[PDB]
Design a protein around this ligand. Structure first.
Ligand code: FES
Ligand code: FES
Ligand code: FES
Ligand code: FES
Ligand code: FES
Ligand code: FES
Ligand SMILES: [Fe+3]
Ligand SMILES: [Fe+3]
Ligand SMILES: [Fe+3]
Ligand SMILES: [Fe+3]
Ligand SMILES: [Fe+3]
Ligand SMILES: [Fe+3]
Lengths: 330, 330, 330, 330, 330, 330
């Protein structure tokens, strides 16, 4: 249902690498996944992470109950095998007949990065990249990948909560609220290279549109820096599979000191954000000046929506044209 | 859809008072309630039981997850606070900024009586009143408020089961059937003051429309009184939250003796009334002579539903115009 | 919804006889059954098994919560009695007044055979008959009736699964796959007397349309016959209630030896056939040559569907007209 | 613990035959049974039903997790095979070396009768036999074997419950109590051939000691006989596994008509008999005159207990010596 | 097991009055209860709360599954009736025989007070009274009786927690810890009339030995007073059924404002107190000067233990001899 | 009782390091653990993994419910704090009073190695060391620490299952059985340095007594290594917490490929080893030639158990004295 069609051009994370390896005893998958209400299967065929529609072209069985055979995905029902382009190469019942030309299942751009598996459902605008994680490569940093966490909220609403400042005092009094710096500021926001960028005082955001946040917290550079990377998988209209990867300089402490803390603040948000109805933000919400980030976010998604209808070039401009508001130089 | 629109003009019970006090440790509420598919929140602000739509005007969190602070209801997300008129009176993020005029939520007529909280969603026709309970104030009687009991059944069908005389022999054979009173009488039924009134020998029904039933019983076992006040709340298309208050003259025995008995009668009804399908009674049900109470009630509802269409006064007339069939005065 | 209407003309099994006896302590029933999204009640009235809409004419209660009384079915709410023709013959509340002419509930052809209760919702074409079980009569044979097994898949897909050959190697490797007889044959299929007939080499299939299969196996081991009779009740758009009656001539062994093995092959099919989506076979399924039985079955159903809209005798032609493709005498 | 040792000399039922067949997909078993706090395994070896300690000689694994292999039982751990005499005849790890003389597990008299598997743990007295079911042979009769029902009560208390008369009015008011035959008779009891015999007026009891009851009912309605055969497996100190086989000559009705009614009377007994504490009847129980059957049963058990410590032929006397109290010919 | 024998002379609460009325639809009971490992049944026979051993003298069935008939308790098995002295008065099976003299079940002192039902298992020292609740009678005070709450701890350990001062800072930081008055004092303790008495600054304890606490909190008499009455039922060696009744002057607020708060502080204690092992305080616990109350408590229980062995007069002295430590005059 | 007393002199693993870090959000612990029926608490105080009895010296709360504060473990009840020696260093209630000398809890030898935490309950014989893991430090190998897996089985029987050669054909037929290596060899077994050593062709076992097993495998499938280190922890009379660490040379594949495989092997063992009864192997088990490893191990344990009785040095000798059967050097 096509108010969300523009979302198909972006790269979305569907599972962790370790979720795929855990899925089937072979460690190759297949793993079933759902993205923007599409039912897909992921599997490692050879050296490629391949993503096809989880529906076989023959009698419509789910390839995710199949098995990986060599470099192919084998349907569990009558054993057809599919190659990295989703084409059937073996029909065991008539191995000497021709393979019908329609014996084919849709395939989607599937690439690994940062420890997660990303899928891009519609490549026809050739102008979106996998979101940016600042801490990959940086060898001073230890990187932990938390289990995915699922919310009954939309990627847009989850996004907005992660970049929200006004809510600390009420949802996170014990864990995030700084009573001396109690009231949030207004900050300039830049569009650059498909990302939103803004800073605090020091927290620095690089939000690859639509659903990814890259938050670099430094302790006025004195101590040492901490990076949060949080991206929402729009599973369906009501649901998100949410991924948090975090990196830290100070690696001497326990990973589960941080994992529990993150876990805690997410548990504080979840019941509120899930309560918001209607699940998608209607046009009768009343804002005030602290909501700059949420408004600017919605402004740009609307433009990306309209730009999409106009077509490829319009969308490329909408996404990548810079819109600088601050003094920082690019 | 809006075939139930007329029902919004009546007072409906949403919860017992204890339910609201129990809902949150402050004993002030808030408590969430569903009335005719509407999501509402109920709270004690100062001296008032207040009812609002359970949806914040900022970013649409459920206020039922919030907390009562002072004489206002404070949202869980960013702590906007709403007064007894549903107007925001504090935006914690910009305390030195003026509150938007649209920063308000719908408020509803909300009044406590008999130990229950009543809400009127539409007050425009200004002509409905909270059902009549005969045993309030009468200091000779001991009143008990059972816990709400829920049925997968509509308020109309719950009402028809309660005033039905024909089911005693079959659903309640060992608890309410009188062997040599096995065939039900046809009875005069008057409309007075927006109530149905009729008796049976005694059993004296005073049913404030649409969903309340007040049954006084001058026992053939006592020469002393016993009173059943039952009111169905239509929470949605398929289910009711049902309330039972009963008073008794012979107040010397255990409350639970009668509570257990009522609970058993309802247990005998419940499966059968839930089995009735469609949930709303269609035109092809075939009534008989002994269904006089069923018929008059469907007739009055149908008239009231029509009157609602033709506007305020035609409704006030269909409710309040008297119609006498028996030989009593009023 | 008129897409499945032609199926109402066939006899469908809804329950075993032992199901009807177990369903109520009388052993006469009533038992609630669902067929083609119709809610029905079955009860034993005298010497007849009769079937009615499980919805009482009076106030729409479910007669399946009622009791059998002599030779009628008694609604649990107000006690109306319905005879074998679905006619109300007693109304307790006015046992003298005349019973209305609308005091009837629809009655459906219902007759027991093979230990199953079969229902024909539409009899206006008068050309359909209960499926053919080869092994009734045959006193050389022991007949076990397995308990109904439910799947989340449609009767057609269930059917195509039962008659499939290509799948043995992949979902039944250790239970049905013969490595010698590893690749599937294409074999003549006859239409005779409304049944599909075809044979293997020694497996003889007789398939009373649409959802019944009678398979005779003259195993390559001795002179010891085996018959499997499998038939799918289409209870709604997504689910089947399936029955299996099996007969064997080597009958000195335990029934549970064959029940376990039967159950195991069904356990292997189930997750896969259930996985198939959409539940109903769409036009974009790619067949190969080995799918002959599938494609001929689907083609015959289509003729039966479109014969139905023509009228009575067009259907009877499409169903019963012989169409023989092999050299066998009928 | 030597308080219950005399019971090891009787045949006790441990499972139905259909239990043994259902317990493993071969239908040969093995099935684990518990009797008099002994853990046993039952399996079908060729034409014999054999019973062994469910504890393998080698490393003490449970043979009930094993498989039947030809005419032996195969331990699941290291594959030792035991024959009908409980002797190991194969040791895979050294199939040439001599099998030790201790490579044996205890074997117990085990023979099928009436559709049940019966076990005699001690055969050294050679004077006990499987209880007497009156209705085997009788081709006028249909014999139903109900599924075993478990109670948390001892076999004696189960027994005294079955033969009780005073309780009908209070736990079976609506199912067995006759208000005409309201008060219980005292009736002669004979000991003959190791059974208690007594009759009512038309109920004839034959009770093969200790825990079996054969009750024949020539009802006051016509010439239609009914037999109930009930027997308690003492599985430990606190619990019974009880069996009921029932036969009827009026056999045109459903089995489930009698199974439900049977089950209902047992449902009524169960909570009460289970409530009795201590589970074993202490000396301070106060009888009245109507407890004749109870007191004679308990007295006979005591003689059987103390005859046991004397030795073989003292027991056989106490058990089999006739002791007739009525005027009937044996 | 007889380290706890002295406890049988005290009055113990076993249930609330409303627990007895809820237990059976008659509102008369019977209700089963367990005290110091004794299995008892409570029932209202006439105007008396009667308590007997929950074991019938005939065949050992539990009278708690019976019913109250007139002024008697009727066993559920064979219908014997027991009067307020535990004597059988009716044997329905031989209504014209003599009633055996042993047809009797033990009866125990059973009296209601404060809304609870108290049982005294051993009256032979005639020198213990039901604990003292300061707020009964006082008409300025509203009295609420919370549902009983069960802990896996002993009455002695639960007692000591309720009178503990040192633990606020750690188990109740959010709810009871007063940071300005952070460290506990040492207070003089008096023995008077079987009660311990001590005060704070103002909290005033009157602990009727062994297991009852009566805590009067006044707000330096300025505002208004609040009374907590908490008593532990020593169910068995590991378990307590705990009763809290509380009274307040200020009755204008919700009962469930206090009930939730109490509930909260109990939830804070429960997992700690349950963790203490061994469950009974062994002789190797190390005390410090803040533990005066716990030591003095243990000193007196030991003396009551020894006094009991010496006999009645010794015990009466131990319990009632005054031992004044403060200046207050008696 | 103290037949397992000798086991207290060995180092035993109680938890993985992550288990301790995960146990409480601080990542410092505490974590409760049971070792040989002893209740202990483990925490990271400063630089040390500390193990104490999980029982406060004040009033016996479990310190595992407490929190780590500074370099001490703080009790949940009154907040006594214990240093790395189990001595209380702070009594919050009387900070200006001296701490009692008996205010201390038993402390135990506690050391981290290989990612597990080891405890030695008795250090008096000072002659045991933490088991040997061959693949620590070897930088060519990738080490994985599985989650602890629990078995209702003793450490002795778990060990015997792991070194057993005779069960492959039966418990693991499709996962570890080699068809033409179906009969197990008898092998030389040496005692060195308190370890059993033996090989099989290769498979090289190094089993530090009593419960550790270090198995190196130079594959016949690779010419590269794979290492299994398995150690059972006896938590009580009937159960074990089992640890598996494995290293591999070919580190290029998914950890989960092997994790899933190990988990499947254990799944095949588990039911069978749990079925073994009695839990501790009695003298009447009949061993055969192929049980050489079983026999030598029971022999060495029995000797060690005896040596413990005769004192420190006789034990140190029975553990450490070498005994060579093969032709290798050491
Ligand atoms: S469905 Fe995939 S092979 Fe038939
Ligand atoms: S959503 Fe309610 S205050 Fe922001
Ligand atoms: S609804 Fe069936 S009898 Fe009235
Ligand atoms: S334990 Fe039974 S074969 Fe070894
Ligand atoms: S047990 Fe109480 S009457 Fe028989
Ligand atoms: S019990 Fe641990 S500090 Fe008191
Ligand atoms: Fe947040
Ligand atoms: Fe009713
Ligand atoms: Fe199949
Ligand atoms: Fe009975
Ligand atoms: Fe406390
Ligand atoms: Fe193994």
């Amino acid at each position: 249902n096509d108010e969300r069609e523009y979302l198909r051009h972006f790269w979305h994370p569907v599972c962790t690498v370790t979720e795929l390896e855990k899925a089937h005893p072979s460690s190759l998958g297949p793993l079933a996944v759902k993205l923007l209400n599409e039912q897909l299967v992921v599997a490692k065929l050879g050296d490629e992470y391949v993503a096809m529609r989880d529906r076989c072209a023959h009698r419509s069985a789910k390839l995710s109950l199949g098995t990986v055979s060599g470099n192919r995905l084998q349907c569990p029902y009558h054993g057809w095998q599919y190659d990295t382009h989703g084409a059937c190469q073996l029909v065991p019942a008539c191995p000497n007949s021709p393979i019908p030309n329609k014996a084919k299942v849709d395939r989607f751009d599937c690439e690994e990065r940062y420890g997660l598996i990303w899928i891009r459902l519609d490549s026809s605008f050739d102008c979106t990249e996998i979101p940016y994680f600042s801490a990959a490569n940086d060898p001073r940093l230890r990187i932990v990948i938390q289990e995915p966490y699922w919310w009954d909220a939309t990627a847009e609403r989850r996004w907005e909560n992660f970049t929200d400042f006004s809510h600390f005092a009420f949802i996170h009094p014990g864990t995030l609220f700084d009573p001396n710096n109690a009231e949030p500021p207004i900050v300039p926001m830049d569009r650059f290279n498909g990302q939103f960028r803004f800073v605090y005082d020091s927290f620095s955001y690089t939000c690859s549109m639509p659903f990814a946040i890259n938050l670099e917290v430094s302790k006025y550079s004195s101590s040492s820096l901490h990076v949060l990377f949080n991206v929402s998988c729009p599973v369906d209209s009501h649901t998100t599979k949410n991924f948090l990867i975090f990196a830290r300089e100070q690696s001497d402490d326990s990973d589960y000191l941080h994992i529990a803390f993150n876990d805690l603040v997410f548990a504080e948000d979840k019941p509120v954000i899930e309560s918001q109805w209607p699940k998608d933000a209607p046009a009768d919400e009343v804002s005030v000046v602290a909501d700059k980030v949420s408004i600017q976010y919605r402004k740009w998604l609307r433009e990306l929506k309209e730009a999409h209808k106009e077509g490829s070039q319009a969308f490329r401009s909408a996404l990548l044209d810079p819109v600088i508001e601050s003094d920082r130089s690019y």
